[PDB]
């Protein structure tokens, strides 16, 4: 049927009544607290909308309104970052001197001696040095003064206001019906063509008209005050012609397919701008133009109201083959009747995308004066890897929640989903094996090496100077990408990244990017990554495939998604639920990504980053110790953790002291987590009994009876403090180190 | 006498474990 | 026929002989057109100043190596031989084009089978004799073609030689079998058949190939296929196509390796420097030929697999609707039927392993298993041990191997001792003759003797690599 | 006993080096312990072996890492509980039975995940063994290194 706007008017009357009725949304919670378990359950169930109401339409409306809420808080945050840039930063000083001045946009108040944290960051400014790369973003945007940031910040607060109103309006006042929400073809069309396509075209516009000219003048060493305001490039064409002659041709070459007339401001240079060590704005312009066209074309695929276009259901139903029975039949119903099926997908692939972004942004630094800002480089890579890893585990969680709650046998009979359930023992047994194989033939090589080195047998080690394990395939791919410009990418001048090959590119004294040579230490660490990813997948996939049932618990779907166990019987059934697989996958996600960011940190500091002599000799931050040290655990303990922790532990009485405190604080929160993970509810409830006795004895026993946390909450609190403590430790470590050496 | 190390350490390392694990395996599986 | 859609439209005349014939002559014509027309295309833009390898001319190098209008130092002096060759193909294309369109739709849909001379050309996919005779008939013309190259190399001028950079006439061809077939056994170099470094071995090779093809030519036309061939191969029309695709894929990779490493049969003055080389930004002819025919070999291997797997599915009596994944006739059993665990190849192979093979005594099973495992277990101990880079590398490795095999012999004795406890037979998929305590002792005795022997044999071969 | 032995050792290290000041001024904040005791006195221990060669503390350097490994292994048994493992072992039992040559051999005792109590025993053992060997290595290497 036809995609159309159809809403109910005034579905939910706006009133503070329910604000004064905590747990109104759940029938069980509505009765009120009897024990302290109620207080936890309130927060635990708050956003679990499927348990509020059965009605999919009411759930869809709650989700749509909540999203306007989350867009509002993210816009408040982004507006705040830009406002702090406008008011409490050395952005204007940093523009004048990017190489010397250190980016800072957080000033601490003088109280209890914490003003020490306002260090000398350059540009006659005292504040906390920021590692979020906002200054490099704003320079890329072509922002050259505090007033432009103020305008952008205020604009953001108005957009955050609009997003709040939208969320209130689209819930309380004009709530779309389920019909509206289930127009997946129209949504994909509008999100591909407008959100991504027109967003990318719009941005190409800004790049071509504002960013490229302003950045070109700044790279030509023109003073920030002397550079014309971005509107002067539109109003005064002559200024723009002088930088990019192609604008002389006007818009006729676009309409007459004489596109070579724009070859000066729409380039395919490759490599990096040698002044800034970032990607060329003219390459970025052409990228966003090319992206925009491909998206606007792509988003005319799905049939809406005019017959032309694909129906996704028919595409899915037609993709079946002799191994997969009914193939992708019934998956359209899964993805259009379950929000959890969509959230699973979108978290899995947005998480995977965020990790791709992490890799692509370090190797091809897109912003001016990012590549040489080693603190920003390390921090944005690590940040986006972490966000990626959490989102992926979220994908798996909501995949398991779908399997328990929203999976229908009738819809999903002899389809790809049904058939994976029927060989899940074959999937998990094989994945179990490949995990053990990778574990032995990746980690076991480190243990072999540690032992050989310890026994004074370096000739018997797995190393470049001993038994070599050269990553020949990755080495071969690096070569192909290095030979690409002029060859298999004829109209490229440089490679996409200097990481693949070409020359050392240097900005100031420092290496922006150079070839990242792969050897035995790179082969070993890559097979550690493969191992730690395959084990995380084993846990999460086992979680999703065995969420509904197993050979142990046939009726696991009836027990639900999040239950602690089915009792000490059958030998003991602790942590069989899909929730408990997510819990265990988080530790393995944490273990996996920890080694990824450690790999990145050490490899970049030893083999890429460093100073460049006038002659052209590169002196690396840790002097290429990775090749010989990163092949033993002792080498990681000594030359990475021990060596590079010197800055964080020696930070007291300086501007980095905060990272020293965060480092210990995080070690504490991590250790605190072991209380929750190693212990059980039974002990704590019995201890609370005695404490409750003493409160009873003095007539201070609370009406809301104290209870030990639930078995599940114990685990949830455990893994929360473990991840917080562990990640925060590395965060403090990375900052204190890279803000000293980088 | 130092040569005894070349006899005893391999015996305690291999012969004794094999003999002990072989017997204990045959004992725990005896019906 | 009618079940196939337009996309798979050429599959409609698998069982129709006339259309299938008409298609083959038509595609022959297309290859001839290209060969002829692109020869003229390359002649039209030959600059005699610049080298051939960095112009992007592919066929003129192939005509150049045969020694068609070249002086001294591999210099193209006359281009009339390239023109006469170009036009000969280009006209032959038009004759084969005519033959193609006739047999396509104007001719009969099925070639008739009868005792008359037109009846001979008619064939059926089931009658194995007629295809075997066709194999031999076209083999005589492969032999003929190889002898025509020899005649060109010996009598009609000769072939270009990169040693002296001149078109020398060949007089003394290498008719030594030990030398020519040595290339197949990797005797004269690591590169094998692509390690030829003189025209004397090239002409000698094409003599041997010539007589083998003609010899096989007479064999196949005068002999029907024996009972062992009747069982091991598939006999549908698509089975023959899948075999031919496997050959084409092998030949494509062979030539792709040849052009990459070999410089004698592909002179550097015509094709360019060895490996993958680009002069002044321009990619060399060698790189184009090497990388294209490598990619086409990977594609034609994908073609073999596709057409071979389709034959194997159809001959098993399975359709592509119900698929290739079934249940064990008792659905509530654990395993599923898959082409990995239930395929006739898998079952025949597993059944015929010494552990399961009928008519082997308990000892003979152990002995064969021992010999196999004992043999391969030497490698790791010899080549990666602590004494690997000493004179005692092989001896150390052998003592290690014997060591491991003795612990594995104890493991067997323990396993047997645990299970064989007065009557109660061991669980697991055993053969009927390993379900007694004495049979298991014989099996362990077999393993020991076999494994020690297998190790000793590998050691004798490793230490006598000379 | 960690707090007791750390205290005993760091106070004595100061007394033995004739540098009681170090303990006296730095022991009042936990960064002092972290830096001046753990970090500072790990220096020689972790160089027991390195790319440049080995010394007599190589065995303590290796035992130090062994302790760290055995401790960490204990966390597995203490954090991940039985139901996860019993469901995993069920698939391994399936795979063995269905593997064509391996299914020749059969277990006498049915493979099962360790009991709830056994896991706490095994977990606590790995944790303890890890704790003792890690500190024994550090205590001996750091003192014997200086003296
Ligand atoms: C979204 C996240 C965000 C975060 C984490 C911060 C954080 C901060 N802001 Mg910023 N701010 C933001 C958004 C944000 N802001 C936005 C959107 C605006 C525009 C209105 C501002 C405008 C602003 C001003 C004008 C000031 C701050 C200040 C501060 C600092 C002290 C907070 C405080 O005054 O507590 C006070 C306690 C209460 C309000 C509760 C009692 C703190 C680092 C202060 C600062 O940096 O001082 C040097 C300061 O003067 N912020
Ligand atoms: C250092 C700490 C540690 C170690 C060593 C392990 C080890 C393992 N975990 Mg565990 N895990 C841990 C912490 C650890 N975990 C923690 C803290 C948690 C709580 C979140 C978990 C939760 C968990 C889950 C949820 C899962 C695992 C799984 C695994 C196994 C993965 C397969 C593999 O790599 O086998 C290879 C073995 C190793 C890498 C261990 C070291 C091997 C040495 C170097 C070789 C042997 C030397 C020698 C022969 C020793 C014997 C000789 C001697 C007797 C004389 C592996 C046995 C997974 C699994 O079982 O799938 C297969 C799985 O799904 N773990
Ligand atoms: C506890 C005592 C112990 C002792 C005494 C040994 C002794 C040895 N081991 Mg070590 N090893 C041990 C425990 C022990 N192992 C444990 C627990 C592990 C697991 C962590 C290992 C893991 C290990 C590896 C991975 C390797 C060794 C190797 C060696 C040999 C190295 C010497 C050499 O270079 O000459 C060369 C010596 C030989 C080539 C072998 C000599 C003859 C053998 C020992 C027996 C011959 C048959 C015997 C008469 C009867 C059957 C065997 C048995 C039932 C006695 C040496 C024999 C290396 C080796 O050479 O393996 C074979 C080797 O690669 N060991
Ligand atoms: C490249 C050379 C080539 C040659 C020589 C042929 C030759 C033939 N094609 Mg084929 N065909 C080809 C490429 C070729 N095709 C391609 C690329 C496609 C995809 C568009 C097809 C799709 C196709 C269909 C749908 C049909 C044929 C048919 C035929 C036969 C025509 C008989 C008739 O008129 O009815 C003839 C043998 C017809 C046939 O198979 O008749 C039995 C027929 O129905 N062809
Ligand atoms: C699709 C287009 C295509 C084109 C334009 C070519 C073109 C060529 N091929 Mg290739 N070939 C192709 C597909 C193609 N091939 C495919 C799909 C395979 C199977 C994978 C092959 C397998 C192949 C081999 C084995 C050889 C060639 C060779 C050649 C070259 C000489 C042809 C010759 O003299 O025939 C020979 C004519 C006769 C024997 C007359 C009968 C010529 C450049 C030859 C060469 O020298 O390339 C390096 C060569 O030895 N081809
Ligand atoms: C993982 C380490 C490993 C190592 C270091 C080796 C090392 C070796 N293998 Mg072994 N192999 C291995 C694993 C390993 N293998 C595995 C997993 C299998 C599968 C079961 C085999 C199956 C195998 C066979 C069938 C043969 C070898 C042979 C060899 C030897 C070749 C030497 C040579 O070039 O002689 C010159 C070549 C010959 C004499 C060829 C004779 C035919 C060498 C010692 C060869 C050998 O044993 O040499 C006597 C040999 O025939 N290997
Ligand atoms: C876990 C991975 C791992 C690997 C790959 C190695 C590898 C090695 N070790 Mg080290 N080692 C390790 C962990 C590892 N180690 C650990 C955890 C320790 C304890 C700290 C040691 C302690 C140690 C010592 C003390 C010594 C070694 C030595 C060695 C070398 C010789 C060992 C040997 O001869 O075994 C022989 C191996 C086999 C017989 C098994 C081979 C497995 C085959 C190839 C699998 C084939 C499967 C096949 C492909 C699939 C089916 C085929 C199909 C056709 C059916 C070798 C390079 C020795 C050396 O001298 O160093 C150079 C040595 O003295 N290791
Ligand atoms: C891997 C190649 C691959 O996915 O093969 C493809 C094959 C599915 O082939 P089909 O032609 O049946 O696929 C049809 C539809 O599922 C796709 O639209 O997968 C399997 O046989 C199951 C997966 C086994 C994988 C084992 C590891
Ligand atoms: C940063 C920020 C901000 C801002 C932003 C902005 C300012 C934006 C804008 C945007 C824009 C400003 C965009 C636009 C765009 C546009 C477009 C997208 C267009 C398109 C067009 C087209 C598509 C065309 C078509 C056509 C026609 C019409 C005719 C002819 C043909 C053609 C086809 C050419 C704020 C404040 C919010 C806050 C936060 C941050
Ligand atoms: C690829 C493939 C395959 C294959 C592979 C393999 C398996 C390999 C290996 C191989 C091997 C594994 C081989 C072996 C061999 C062995 C031998 C060759 C032996 C020998 C022995 C001997 C001869 C001995 C002798 C003796 C004795 C017994 C006793 C006394 C002394 C003496 C010395 C006399 C299969 C079929 C699976 C499947 C399909 C695919
Ligand atoms: C320590 C621990 C407890 C005990 C912890 C409990 C009961 C949490 C209680 C802590 C909160 C912070 C109490 C908050 C009480 C009041 C709300 C505070 C009011 C005063 C403020 C306004 C300042 C468990 O219940 C438990 C359960 C299952 C597995 C492991 C464990 C576990 O390790
Ligand atoms: S120990 Fe806890 S999780 Fe395990 S069975 Fe008992 S109550 Fe359930």
- Atom 34 (ligand 5): residue with closest C-alpha? C62
D90, with CB counted inside 10 A (0-12, 13-18, 19+), is buried
The reply to whether residue A323 touches residue C323, judged by beta carbons under 8 angstroms, is yes
Q: Which residues of C197-223 are buried (b: 16+ CB within 10 A; e: fewer)?
A: eebbbbbbbbbbbbeebbebbeebbee
Task: Decide if A572 contacts A582 (C-beta within 8 A).
Answer: no
In angstroms, the CA A707 to CA C231 distance is: 75
Place of tokens 């792509």: A298
The DSSP output letter for C6 is: G
3-state secondary structure of A105: strand
Boundaries of domain holding A643: 1-742
In angstroms, the CA D98 to CA D81 distance is: 27
The DSSP output letter for A103 is: P
Task: Give bridge partners of residue A513 from the DSSP assignment.
Answer: A505
User: How was this model experimentally determined?
Assistant: cryo-EM
The helix (run of H) or strand (run of E) holding residue A176 is strand A174-176
Task: Decide if A24 contacts A53 (C-beta within 8 A).
Answer: no
- Give the CB-side neighbour count of residue C328, counting CA atoms within 13 A: 9
Report helix angle A134-141 to A56-87, nearest 10: 90
Q: Nearest CA of chain C to the CA of D106: how many Å?
A: 5
Place of tokens 């061939």: C229
Strand order in the sheet with A104-106: A104-106, A126-129, A119-120
In angstroms, the CA C164 to CA C141 distance is: 33
Q: Is D97 on the interface with C (CB under 8 A)?
A: yes
Q: Is the CA virtual torsion A72, A73, A74, A75 positive or negative?
A: positive
Quick check: CB of A680 below 6 Å from ligand 11?
yes
Residue C250 to residues A27, C190, C264, C298, Cα–Cα distance (Å): 71, 18, 21, 9
CB atoms within 10 A of CB C37: 14
Q: Is D115 on the interface with A (CB under 8 A)?
A: yes
Contacts of A488 (CB under 8 A, 6+ apart): A480
Q: Which among A142, A147, A144, A131 has a CA at the least distance from the CA of A93?
A: A144
3-state secondary structure of A104: strand
State yes or no: chains A and B have 3 or more CB pairs below 8 A. Answer: no
Place of tokens 């002029």: A486
Structure tokens at C4: 């196939």
Task: Decide if A138 contacts A127 (C-beta within 8 A).
Answer: no
The reply to whether residue C414 touches residue B30, judged by beta carbons under 8 angstroms, is no
Which residue of B13, B26, B27 to mutate against C (max C Cβ within 10 Å)?
B26
In angstroms, the CA A207 to CA A200 distance is: 10
Task: Decide if C451 contacts C366 (C-beta within 8 A).
Answer: no
Place of tokens 């389709």: C310
Chain D residue with Cα closest to A664: D31
Ligand nearest D101 Cα, by number?
A: 7
Structure tokens at A702: 């609370």
* Long-range CB contacts (within 8 A, 24+) of C166-169: C166/C72, C166/C73, C167/C67, C167/C70, C168/C199
Place of tokens 């690591």: C190
A413, with CB counted inside 10 A (0-12, 13-18, 19+), is middle
Task: Decide if A546 contacts D84 (C-beta within 8 A).
Answer: no
* φ, ψ for residue C410, nearest 5 deg: -65, -45
Task: Decide if C303 contacts C311 (C-beta within 8 A).
Answer: no
Q: Which among A328, A338, A341 has a CA at the least distance from the CA of A544?
A: A341
3-state secondary structure of A441: helix
Listing DSSP states for A353-370 in one string gives HHHHHHHHHHHS--STT-
- Cβ-based contacts under 8 A for chains B and C: 14
Q: Which among A517, A503, A501 has a CA at the least distance from the CA of A603?
A: A517
Chain D hits for A536, Cβ within 8 Å: none
Integer-rounded Cα Rg, in Å, for chain D is 22
Integer-rounded Cα Rg, in Å, for chain A is 29
For chain B, the residues whose C-beta falls within 8 A of a C-beta of chain C are 18, 22, 25-26, 29-31
A88, with CB counted inside 10 A (0-12, 13-18, 19+), is middle
Ligand nearest A711 Cα, by number?
A: 11
In angstroms, the CA A565 to CA A577 distance is: 7
Place of tokens 């003048």: A217
A54, with CB counted inside 10 A (0-12, 13-18, 19+), is exposed
* φ, ψ for residue A653, nearest 5 deg: 75, 20
The DSSP output letter for D54 is: E
Q: Which among C457, C373, C356, C466 has a CA at the least distance from the CA of C411?
A: C373
The DSSP output letter for C426 is: P
Contacts of A374 (CB under 8 A, 6+ apart): A510, A604, A609, A621, A738, A741, A742
Task: Decide if A127 contacts A88 (C-beta within 8 A).
Answer: yes
Task: Give bridge partners of residue C201 from the DSSP assignment.
Answer: none
In angstroms, the CA A738 to CA A373 distance is: 10
D143, with CB counted inside 10 A (0-12, 13-18, 19+), is middle
Nearest Cβ partner of A572 from D48, D82, D123?
Answer: D82
Structure tokens at C104: 């396509």
Contacts of A259 (CB under 8 A, 6+ apart): A253, A266
Place of tokens 């050979």: A551
Is A667 known as a binding-site position? Answer: yes
Task: Decide if C11 contacts C4 (C-beta within 8 A).
Answer: yes
* φ, ψ for residue C168, nearest 5 deg: -75, 145
Task: Give bridge partners of residue C166 from the DSSP assignment.
Answer: C161
Q: Is C426 on the interface with D (CB under 8 A)?
A: yes
D127, with CB counted inside 10 A (0-12, 13-18, 19+), is buried
Task: Decide if A510 contacts A609 (C-beta within 8 A).
Answer: yes
3-state secondary structure of C454: helix
Is A683 known as a binding-site position? Answer: yes
In angstroms, the CA A49 to CA A387 distance is: 24
Contacts of A406 (CB under 8 A, 6+ apart): A334, A337, A338, A340, A341
The reply to whether residue D101 touches residue C353, judged by beta carbons under 8 angstroms, is yes
* φ, ψ for residue C424, nearest 5 deg: -55, 105
The DSSP output letter for A499 is: T
Listing DSSP states for A220-247 in one string gives TT--TTTSPPTTHHHH-HHHHHHH-GGG
Number of domains in chain A: 1
Q: Is D25 on the interface with C (CB under 8 A)?
A: no
**Strand runs labelled E in C205-269:** none
CA C170-C173-C176 angle, to 5 degrees, is 165
Contacts of C225 (CB under 8 A, 6+ apart): C128, C129, C132
Task: Decide if A175 contacts A8 (C-beta within 8 A).
Answer: yes
Chain D residue with Cα closest to C419: D108
The helix (run of H) or strand (run of E) holding residue C199 is helix C199-222
The reply to whether residue A546 touches residue D87, judged by beta carbons under 8 angstroms, is yes
Contacts of D101 (CB under 8 A, 6+ apart): C350, C353, C355
Contacts of D83 (CB under 8 A, 6+ apart): A552, A565, A566, A572, A573, A574, A575, A576, A580, D113
Q: Which among A562, A558, A560 has a CA at the least distance from the CA of A575?
A: A562
- Give the CB-side neighbour count of residue A293, counting CA atoms within 13 A: 5
The reply to whether residue C341 touches residue D100, judged by beta carbons under 8 angstroms, is yes
Task: Give bridge partners of residue C421 from the DSSP assignment.
Answer: C424
Structure tokens at C413: 């004795």
Task: Give bridge partners of residue A485 from the DSSP assignment.
Answer: A489
Q: Is the CA virtual torsion A365, A369, A373, A379 positive or negative?
A: negative
For the domain that residue A437 is a member of, what is the CATH number? 1.20.1130.10
The DSSP output letter for A17 is: G
Which chains lie within 8 Å of chain A at 3 or more CB pairs, if any? C, D
Chain C hits for B31, Cβ within 8 Å: 421, 424
CB atoms within 10 A of CB A621: 23
- Cβ-based contacts under 8 A for chains C and D: 26
Four-CA torsion C205, C211, C214, C217, nearest 10 degrees: -90
Size (chain A), residues = 742
Contacts of A314 (CB under 8 A, 6+ apart): none
Listing DSSP states for A666-710 in one string gives HHHHHHHHHHHHHS-HHHHHHHHHHHHHHHHHTT---SSB--PPP
Interval between CA C99 and ligand 4 midpoint (Å): 15
| Phi-psi sector, C333: left (phi>0), alpha (psi -120 to 50), beta | beta
Interval between CA A331 and ligand 1 midpoint (Å): 47
Integer-rounded Cα Rg, in Å, for chain C is 30
Contacts of A615 (CB under 8 A, 6+ apart): none
Strand order in the sheet with A618-620: A505-507, A510-513, A610-612, A618-620
Ligand nearest A436 Cα, by number?
A: 2
In angstroms, the CA C41 to CA C45 distance is: 7
3-state secondary structure of A610: strand
Strands C278-279 and C282-283: antiparallel
Task: Decide if A495 contacts A271 (C-beta within 8 A).
Answer: yes
Structure tokens at A6: 């159809």
The reply to whether residue C421 touches residue B25, judged by beta carbons under 8 angstroms, is no
The reply to whether residue A323 touches residue C324, judged by beta carbons under 8 angstroms, is yes
Residue C40 to residues C31, C46, C51, Cα–Cα distance (Å): 15, 10, 18
Structure tokens at A140: 């890329």
In angstroms, the CA A375 to CA A382 distance is: 11
Place of tokens 């996958």: A585
**End-to-end CA gap in chain B:** 45
Residue A720 to residues A104, A354, A587, C244, Cα–Cα distance (Å): 30, 22, 10, 62
Contacts of D29 (CB under 8 A, 6+ apart): none
Q: Which residues of A378-392 are buried (b: 16+ CB within 10 A; e: fewer)?
A: bbbbbbbbbbbbbbb
* φ, ψ for residue C190, nearest 5 deg: -75, -25
3-state secondary structure of A467: strand
Residue B6 to residues A560, B3, B9, C381, C395, Cα–Cα distance (Å): 62, 5, 6, 22, 20
* Long-range CB contacts (within 8 A, 24+) of A305-314: A305/A2, A305/A3, A309/A185, A309/A189, A310/A185, A311/A185, A312/A184, A312/A185, A312/A188
Task: Decide if C174 contacts C167 (C-beta within 8 A).
Answer: no
């Amino acid at each position: 049927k036809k995609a159309r706007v159809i809403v109910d008017k005034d579905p939910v009357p706006t009133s503070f009544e329910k604000w004064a009725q905590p747990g109104h949304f759940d029938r069980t919670l509505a009765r009120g607290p009897k024990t302290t378990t109620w207080i936890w359950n309130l927060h635990a169930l708050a956003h679990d909308f499927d348990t509020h109401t059965s009605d999919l339409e009411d759930i869809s409306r709650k989700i749509f309104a909540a999203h306007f809420g989350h867009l509002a808080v993210v816009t408040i945050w982004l507006s705040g970052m830009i406002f702090h840039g406008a008011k409490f930063s050395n952005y204007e000083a940093w523009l004048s001197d990017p190489l010397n001045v250190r980016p800072s946009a957080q000033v601490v108040w003088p109280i209890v001696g914490q003003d020490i944290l306002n260090g000398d960051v350059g540009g006659g400014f005292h504040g906390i040095q920021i590692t979020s790369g906002l200054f490099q973003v704003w320079r890329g945007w072509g922002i050259t003064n505090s007033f432009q940031l103020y305008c952008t910040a205020i604009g953001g607060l108005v957009l955050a206001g609009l997003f709040l109103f939208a969320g209130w309006f689209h819930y309380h006042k004009r709530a779309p019906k389920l019909e509206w929400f289930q127009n997946v073809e129209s949504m994909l069309n509008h999100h591909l063509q407008v959100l991504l396509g027109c967003g990318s075209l719009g941005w190409a516009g800004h790049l071509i008209h504002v960013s490229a000219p302003i950045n070109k003048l700044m790279d030509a060493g023109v003073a920030v005050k002397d550079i014309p305001l971005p509107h002067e490039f539109i109003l005064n064409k002559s200024l723009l012609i002088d930088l990019f002659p192609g604008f002389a041709a006007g818009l006729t070459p676009f309409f007459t397919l004489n596109w070579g007339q724009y070859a000066d401001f729409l380039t395919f240079k490759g490599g990096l701008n040698p002044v800034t060590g970032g990607l060329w704005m003219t390459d970025i312009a052409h990228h966003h133009l090319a992206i925009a066209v491909v998206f606007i074309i792509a988003g005319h695929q799905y049939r809406t109201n005019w017959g032309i276009g694909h129906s996704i259901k028919e595409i899915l139903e037609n993709h079946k083959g002799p191994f997969t029975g009914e193939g992708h039949k019934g998956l359209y119903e899964n993805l259009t009747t379950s929000w959890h099926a969509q959230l699973a997908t979108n978290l899995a692939f947005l998480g995977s995308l965020t990790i791709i972004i992490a890799h692509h942004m370090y190797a091809m630094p897109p912003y001016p004066y990012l590549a040489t800002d080693y603190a920003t480089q390390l921090c944005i890579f690590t940040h986006h890897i972490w966000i990626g890893g959490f989102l992926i585990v979220g994908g798996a969680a909501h995949a398991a929640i779908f399997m328990v709650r929203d999976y229908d046998p009738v819809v999903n009979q002899n389809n790809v989903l049904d058939r994976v359930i029927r060989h899940r023992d074959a999937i998990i047994s094989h994945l179990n094996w490949v995990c053990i194989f990778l574990g032995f033939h990746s980690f076991g090589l480190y243990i072999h090496n540690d032992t050989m080195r310890a026994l004074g047998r370096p000739q018997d080690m797995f190393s470049d100077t001993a038994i070599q394990l050269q990553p020949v395939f990755a080495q071969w791919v690096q070569n192909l990408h290095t030979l690409a410009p002029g060859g298999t990418a004829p109209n490229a001048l440089e490679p996409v990244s200097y990481a693949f090959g070409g020359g050392v590119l240097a900005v100031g004294g420092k290496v922006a990017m150079m070839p990242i040579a792969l050897g035995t230490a790179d082969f070993l660490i890559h097979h550690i990554h493969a191992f730690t990813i395959h084990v995380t997948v084993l846990i999460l996939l086992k979680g999703v495939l065995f969420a509904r049932s197993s050979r142990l618990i046939p009726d696991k779907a009836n027990l639900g998604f999040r239950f602690p166990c089915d009792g000490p019987g059958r030998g003991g059934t602790c942590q069989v639920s899909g929730w408990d697989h997510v819990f265990l996958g988080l530790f393995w996600m944490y273990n996996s990504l920890s080694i990824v960011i450690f790999h990145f940190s050490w490899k970049m500091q030893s083999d890429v980053w460093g100073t460049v002599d006038a002659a052209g000799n590169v002196s690396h931050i840790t002097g290429g110790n990775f090749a010989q040290s990163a092949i033993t655990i002792n080498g990681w303990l000594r030359d990475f953790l021990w060596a590079q922790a010197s800055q964080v532990i020696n930070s007291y009485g300086s501007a980095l002291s905060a990272y020293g405190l965060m480092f210990l604080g995080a070690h504490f929160v991590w250790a605190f987590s072991l209380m929750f993970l190693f212990s059980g509810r039974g002990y704590w409830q019995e201890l609370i009994e005695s404490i409750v006795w003493a409160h009873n004895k003095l007539k201070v026993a609370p009406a809301i009876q104290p209870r030990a946390l639930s078995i599940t909450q114990g685990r949830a609190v455990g893994v929360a403090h473990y991840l917080l403590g562990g990640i925060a430790t590395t965060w403090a470590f990375f900052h204190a180190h890279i803000l000293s050496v980088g | 006498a130092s040569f005894l190390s070349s006899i005893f350490v391999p015996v305690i390392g291999w012969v004794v474990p094999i003999a002990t694990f072989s017997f204990l395996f045959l004992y725990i599986e005896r019906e | 026929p009618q079940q196939y859609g337009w996309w798979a439209g050429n599959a409609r005349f698998i069982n129709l002989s006339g259309r299938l014939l008409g298609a083959h002559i038509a595609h022959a014509g297309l290859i001839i057109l290209w060969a002829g027309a692109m020869t003229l295309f390359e002649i039209t833009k030959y600059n005699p100043s610049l080298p051939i390898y960095e112009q992007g001319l592919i066929l003129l190098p192939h005509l150049a190596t045969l020694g068609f209008g070249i002086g001294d130092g591999g210099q193209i002096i006359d281009t009339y031989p390239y023109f006469v060759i170009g036009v000969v193909h280009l006209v032959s294309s038009a004759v084969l084009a005519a033959g193609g369109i006739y047999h396509a739709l104007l001719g009969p849909e099925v070639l008739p089978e009868n005792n008359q001379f037109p009846g001979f050309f008619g064939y059926d996919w089931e009658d194995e004799d007629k295809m075997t005779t066709i194999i031999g008939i076209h083999l005589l013309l492969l032999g003929a073609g190889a002898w025509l190259l020899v005649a060109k190399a010996l009598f009609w001028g000769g072939l270009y030689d990169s040693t002296v950079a001149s078109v020398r006439v060949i007089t003394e061809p290498t008719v030594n079998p030990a030398r020519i077939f040595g290339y197949l056994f990797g005797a004269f170099g690591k590169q094998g058949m692509a390690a030829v470094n003189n025209l004397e071995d090239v002409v000698g090779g094409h003599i041997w190939v010539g007589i083998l093809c003609i010899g096989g030519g007479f064999w196949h036309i005068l002999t029907q296929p024996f009972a062992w061939a009747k069982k091991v191969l598939f006999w549908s029309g698509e089975a023959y196509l899948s075999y031919s695709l496997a050959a084409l894929a092998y030949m494509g990779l062979l030539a792709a390796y040849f052009v990459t490493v070999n410089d004698t049969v592909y002179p550097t003055e015509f094709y360019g420097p060895l490996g993958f080389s680009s002069t002044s930004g321009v990619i060399s002819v060698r790189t184009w030929l090497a990388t294209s025919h490598f990619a086409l070999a990977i594609v034609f291997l994908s073609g073999h697999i596709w057409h071979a797997l389709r034959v194997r599915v159809l001959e098993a009596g399975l359709n592509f609707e119900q698929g290739v994944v079934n249940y064990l006739d008792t659905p509530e059993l654990g395993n599923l039927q898959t082409p990995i665990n239930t395929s006739d190849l898998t079952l025949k192979f597993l059944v015929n392993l010494p552990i399961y093979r009928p008519g082997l005594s308990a000892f003979a099973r152990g002995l064969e298993i021992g010999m196999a495992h004992g043999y391969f277990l030497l490698g790791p101990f010899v080549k990666l041990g602590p004494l690997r880079n000493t004179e005692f590398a092989n001896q150390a490795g052998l003592l290690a191997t014997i060591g491991l095999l003795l612990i594995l012999s104890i493991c067997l004795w323990l396993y047997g001792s645990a299970w064989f406890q007065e009557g109660k037979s061991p669980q697991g998929e055993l053969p009927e003759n390993l379900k007694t305590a004495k049979s298991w002792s014989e099996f362990n005795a077999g393993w020991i003797v076999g494994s020690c022997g297998g190790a000793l044999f590998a050691y004798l071969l490793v230490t006598n690599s000379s | 006993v960690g707090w007791v032995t750390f205290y005993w050792h760091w106070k004595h290290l100061g007394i033995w080096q004739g540098n009681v000041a170090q303990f006296n001024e730095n022991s009042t904040y936990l960064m002092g312990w972290f830096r001046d005791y753990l970090w500072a006195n790990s220096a020689q221990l972790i160089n027991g072996y390195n790319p440049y060669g080995v010394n007599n503390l190589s065995v303590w350097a290796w035992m130090f890492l062994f302790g760290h490994l055995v401790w960490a292994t204990g966390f597995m048994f203490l954090i991940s509980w039985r139901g996860y493992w019993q469901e995993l072992i069920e698939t391994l039992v399936w795979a063995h039975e269905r593997t064509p040559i391996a299914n020749l051999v059969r277990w006498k005792d049915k493979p099962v995940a360790l009991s709830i109590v056994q896991a706490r025993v095994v977990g606590l053992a790995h944790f303890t063994v890890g704790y003792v060997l890690t500190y024994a290595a550090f205590l001996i290497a750091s003192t014997a290194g200086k003296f």
